[PDB]
Paper text:
Despite the requirements for aliphatic residues at a and d, up to 40% of these can be changed to other side chains without compromising barrel integrity. We introduced mutations at one or two of these sites to generate four groups of αHB: Group I had entirely hydrophobic interiors, but with different sizes and shapes of channel; Groups II and III had polar uncharged or polar charged residues, respectively, at specific points along the channel; and Group IV had aromatic residues installed in their channels. Finally, one third of the designs were crystallized and yielded 12 X-ray crystal structures, all of which were open αHBs with fully accessible channels. Focusing on the small molecules, the αSA signal from the more-polar AAs and CHOs is dominated by the polar and charged Group II and III αHBs.
αHBs are oligomers of 5 or more α-helical peptides that assemble into coiled-coil structures with central solvent-accessible channels. We targeted two properties of αHBs: oligomeric state, which directly affects the internal diameter of the channel; and the identities of channel-facing residues, which fine tune this dimension and introduce different chemistries. The αHBs are loaded with an environment sensitive dye (in this case, 1,6-diphenyl-1,3,5-hexatriene, DPH) that binds within the channels and fluoresces.
Numbering used by the authors:
A (entry chain B), B (entry chain A), C (entry chain B), D (entry chain A), E (entry chain B), F (entry chain A), ...: 1 to 30
The structure:
Amino acid sequence: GEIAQALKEIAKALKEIAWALKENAQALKG
Amino acid sequence: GEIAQALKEIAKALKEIAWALKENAQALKG
Amino acid sequence: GEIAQALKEIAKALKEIAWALKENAQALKG
Amino acid sequence: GEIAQALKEIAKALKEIAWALKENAQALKG
Amino acid sequence: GEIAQALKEIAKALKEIAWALKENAQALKG
Amino acid sequence: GEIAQALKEIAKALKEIAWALKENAQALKG
Amino acid sequence: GEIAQALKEIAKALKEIAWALKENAQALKG
Amino acid sequence: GEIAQALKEIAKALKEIAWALKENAQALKG
């Protein structure tokens, strides 16, 4: 269904936020 | 449907936050 | 509809968060 | 309706987070 | 209604996040 | 109801994030 | 119910974010 | 159900954000 699909897209976007925050951690290390 | 479309716009906005955080990581790396 | 409109306003606010985080990245650069 | 009104209050609160993050960018620029 | 009330409590909590981020900005200033 | 109760638990968790961010501001002030 | 349970899991995850932010505050102190 | 499953994926993504923030704390500690 379209609502579950859209919530799955929000989950994917939050995972992209996590990946970006890992990039910040690496930049501080470095 | 309009609710699914609005949730997809929230996902796009969260991807924009992810990209902004990537930009911060690049700024720290410099 | 009013719920979809309100979700669209949440998306716009998350885009404002992204813009603010870009301003942080620029301040670090710088 | 009260649910749409409450979602609009969440959007306003997210704009407040955006403004706080702008304040952080200004503090770093100084 | 209880759902609208609970969403209003989430809005209040996001405003508390904004206030905490302002405190961070002040600490950097500083 | 159980959905309202779960949304109230999300609000409490967001207040915990706010308090953690206050802690970060205090750490920067030191 | 499964939706309330899933919202409770989102609350637990936001509490984990709060704990991680406390770890950041401690690292700055340090 | 598919909505509960999608909300569980959002919770997992928020745990990924928590772990990324832990990584940032470790980077600052070094």
